[PDB]
Design a protein around this motif. Structure first.
Motif, PDB file in Angstrom:
ATOM      1  N   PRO A  73       0.513  -1.330  -0.186  1.00  0.00           N
ATOM      2  CA  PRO A  73      -0.240   0.184   0.166  1.00  0.00           C
ATOM      3  C   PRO A  73       0.799   0.988  -0.162  1.00  0.00           C
ATOM      4  O   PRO A  73       0.699   2.050   0.744  1.00  0.00           O
ATOM      5  CB  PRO A  73      -0.616  -0.107   1.148  1.00  0.00           C
ATOM      6  CG  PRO A  73      -0.368  -1.535   1.698  1.00  0.00           C
ATOM      7  CD  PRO A  73       1.054  -1.936   0.823  1.00  0.00           C
ATOM      8  N   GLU A  74       1.901   1.429  -1.043  1.00  0.00           N
ATOM      9  CA  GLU A  74       2.628   3.134  -1.078  1.00  0.00           C
ATOM     10  C   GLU A  74       2.513   2.904  -2.774  1.00  0.00           C
ATOM     11  O   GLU A  74       1.884   2.359  -3.340  1.00  0.00           O
ATOM     12  CB  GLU A  74       3.950   2.472  -0.283  1.00  0.00           C
ATOM     13  N   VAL A  75       3.138   4.660  -2.970  1.00  0.00           N
ATOM     14  CA  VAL A  75       3.905   4.277  -3.971  1.00  0.00           C
ATOM     15  C   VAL A  75       5.015   3.841  -4.846  1.00  0.00           C
ATOM     16  O   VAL A  75       5.172   3.369  -5.886  1.00  0.00           O
ATOM     17  CB  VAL A  75       3.486   5.885  -4.566  1.00  0.00           C
ATOM     18  CG1 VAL A  75       3.428   6.168  -5.913  1.00  0.00           C
ATOM     19  CG2 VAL A  75       1.893   5.892  -4.106  1.00  0.00           C
ATOM     20  N   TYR A  76       6.029   4.749  -3.838  1.00  0.00           N
ATOM     21  CA  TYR A  76       7.545   4.396  -3.980  1.00  0.00           C
ATOM     22  C   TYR A  76       8.130   2.590  -4.044  1.00  0.00           C
ATOM     23  O   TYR A  76       9.360   2.747  -4.789  1.00  0.00           O
ATOM     24  CB  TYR A  76       8.617   5.609  -2.971  1.00  0.00           C
ATOM     25  CG  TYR A  76       8.897   4.931  -2.518  1.00  0.00           C
ATOM     26  CD1 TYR A  76      10.791   4.556  -1.902  1.00  0.00           C
ATOM     27  CD2 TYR A  76       8.082   5.039  -0.909  1.00  0.00           C
ATOM     28  CE1 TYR A  76      10.963   3.302  -0.546  1.00  0.00           C
ATOM     29  CE2 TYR A  76       8.863   4.888   0.589  1.00  0.00           C
ATOM     30  CZ  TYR A  76      10.067   3.908   0.375  1.00  0.00           C
ATOM     31  OH  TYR A  76      10.666   3.721   1.803  1.00  0.00           O
ATOM     32  N   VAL A  77       7.516   2.402  -2.976  1.00  0.00           N
ATOM     33  CA  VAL A  77       8.147   1.148  -3.131  1.00  0.00           C
ATOM     34  C   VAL A  77       7.285   0.029  -3.724  1.00  0.00           C
ATOM     35  O   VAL A  77       8.597  -0.277  -4.443  1.00  0.00           O
ATOM     36  CB  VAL A  77       6.983  -0.255  -1.272  1.00  0.00           C
ATOM     37  CG1 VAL A  77       7.450  -1.671  -1.746  1.00  0.00           C
ATOM     38  CG2 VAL A  77       7.461   0.865  -0.212  1.00  0.00           C
ATOM     39  N   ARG A  78       6.737  -0.074  -4.862  1.00  0.00           N
ATOM     40  CA  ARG A  78       6.305  -0.542  -5.953  1.00  0.00           C
ATOM     41  C   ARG A  78       7.290  -0.038  -6.597  1.00  0.00           C
ATOM     42  O   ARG A  78       8.252  -1.333  -8.308  1.00  0.00           O
ATOM     43  CB  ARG A  78       4.781  -0.642  -6.395  1.00  0.00           C
ATOM     44  CG  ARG A  78       3.713  -0.241  -5.415  1.00  0.00           C
ATOM     45  CD  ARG A  78       2.524   0.009  -5.613  1.00  0.00           C
ATOM     46  NE  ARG A  78       2.396   0.677  -6.785  1.00  0.00           N
ATOM     47  CZ  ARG A  78       1.199   1.817  -6.614  1.00  0.00           C
ATOM     48  NH1 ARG A  78       0.649   1.766  -5.027  1.00  0.00           N
ATOM     49  NH2 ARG A  78       1.277   2.581  -7.178  1.00  0.00           N
ATOM     50  N   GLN A  79       7.556   1.204  -7.191  1.00  0.00           N
ATOM     51  CA  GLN A  79       8.076   1.480  -8.186  1.00  0.00           C
ATOM     52  C   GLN A  79       9.913   1.098  -8.071  1.00  0.00           C
ATOM     53  O   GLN A  79       9.996   0.945  -8.804  1.00  0.00           O
ATOM     54  CB  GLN A  79       8.179   2.820  -7.652  1.00  0.00           C
TER      55      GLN A  79
END
Length: 419
Positions: free
Chosen positions: A226-232
């Motif tokens: 549930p994150e943005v930079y983690v998946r990227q």
């Protein structure tokens, strides 16, 4: 250090005395103190004293000394990193003078104590902190909260830096240590991402790809964080690992490709992998599709459906199932169509029920094994001179490409009857 750890019951006193004398002693005590203060990413007692014992600080200082004096040995970095991580995991769990002066000056008796206690009572956290402050006191509070939060993760920051440096050095050590370090880094990046993203975001952009070749399934499973930079970051790492080693992210990524987080990342990963040899990617995709199609033949599916319908007979559900089966079924294809093409007609005539029993009996009798590649799937046959990788080559320095496919396919006489 190992000898000290072994005899920890009769060495704690000396370490405590050394620590006390440092912040203000037999031969061993003075000798260790002298070695610790040797003149020269640092350890300070102002932050390590939130639960870590005094003698336990000497070990960390010794490991740091070894890492600074010997920046080429991976064992020193691994030891210092393990100690920092072990103590960080405990200080963070247990935690969940200038600061007070700064808060008083920015917010110029019980009110001050209540505000100080609420500033670190349990430190989407911004909303909770603001609500607690408003309900307790009723701005410089945010700065103090951020400073204390970043200060509490000092051990984690040191451990992250040490693991990154160790992995960089091993671009010489047992694979077990590499796997443990990678798993710990992944756990730190998932559990506490926004707390210390300034370190992981930069560390993950320079590590090699060889040490990250053993926990690929974990990386793929952690793509829905549930994150943005983690998946990227995970997607970028996987894409980088794909280069020079495509036989490790070929099958999982393609199978997964065929919430949008679990699909967008796969799309960019497959695109990056196909940016080098698109022909091979298309060929493997077609091979996977053909294998999925030949997985269960229409005859087996029809027999299973007929058996289930007959068992559940003793309506609308039966008619719907028959219609769906007929629609799904529209060399082997033509043979089946010309041999059992009256199923639709029989069902339609009986709709207004011996047809089902007759079909089931015929299928059971015809079931009682040898199959041909040309008849099963013409795409599989004639395939040769392919640079595709074998289905599973985790440990293979010189990958072997598939040359051909066996023309004869057998079936086991078991319950599920595999091929």
């Amino acid at each position: 250090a190992k000898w000290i750890q072994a005899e920890w019951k009769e060495i704690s006193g000396q370490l405590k005395q050394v620590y006390r004398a440092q912040h203000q002693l037999s031969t061993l005590s003075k000798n260790i103190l002298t070695l610790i203060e040797l003149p020269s990413r640092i350890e300070s007692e102002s932050t390590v004293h939130i639960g870590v014992g005094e003698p336990d600080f000497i070990l960390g200082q010794l490991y740091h000394l070894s890492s600074v004096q010997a920046p080429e040995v991976a064992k020193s970095w691994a030891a210092l990193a393990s100690w920092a991580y072990r103590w960080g995991r405990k200080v963070v769990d247990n935690a969940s003078x200038x600061x007070x002066x700064x808060x008083x000056x920015x917010x110029x008796x019980x009110x001050x104590x209540x505000x100080x206690x609420x500033x670190x009572x349990x430190x989407x956290x911004x909303x909770x902190x603001x609500x607690x402050x408003x309900x307790x006191x009723x701005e410089g509070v945010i700065k103090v909260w951020r400073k204390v939060v970043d200060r509490i993760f000092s051990l984690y920051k040191l451990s992250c830096s040490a693991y990154f440096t160790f992995l960089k050095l091993n671009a010489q050590s047992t694979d077990d240590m590499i796997v443990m370090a990678t798993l710990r880094l992944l756990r730190l990046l998932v559990k506490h991402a926004g707390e210390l993203r300034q370190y992981l975001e930069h560390g993950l952009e320079t590590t090699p790809t060889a040490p990250w070749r053993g926990i690929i399934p974990q990386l793929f499973s952690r793509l829905n964080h549930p994150e943005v930079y983690v998946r990227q970051s995970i997607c970028n790492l996987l894409c980088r690992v794909a280069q020079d080693s495509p036989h490790l992210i070929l099958y999982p990524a393609i199978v997964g490709t065929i919430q949008a987080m679990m699909q967008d990342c796969y799309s960019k990963i497959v695109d990056k992998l196909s940016s080098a040899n698109p022909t091979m990617v298309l060929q493997v995709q077609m091979l996977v599709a053909e294998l999925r199609r030949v997985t269960v033949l229409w005859d087996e599916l029809w027999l299973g459906v007929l058996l289930q319908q007959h068992m559940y007979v003793l309506x609308x559900x039966x008619x719907x199932x028959x219609x769906x089966x007929x629609x799904x079924x529209x060399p082997h294809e033509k043979w089946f169509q010309d041999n059992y093409g009256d199923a639709i007609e029989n069902a339609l005539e009986k709709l207004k029920x011996x047809x089902x029993x007759x079909x089931x009996x015929x299928x059971x009798x015809x079931x009682x094994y040898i199959l041909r590649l040309e008849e099963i799937s013409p795409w599989l046959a004639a395939m040769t001179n392919t640079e595709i990788a074998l289905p599973g080559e985790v440990s293979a320095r010189d990958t072997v490409t598939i040359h051909s496919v066996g023309g004869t396919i057998t079936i086991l006489p078991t319950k599920t009857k595999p091929k």
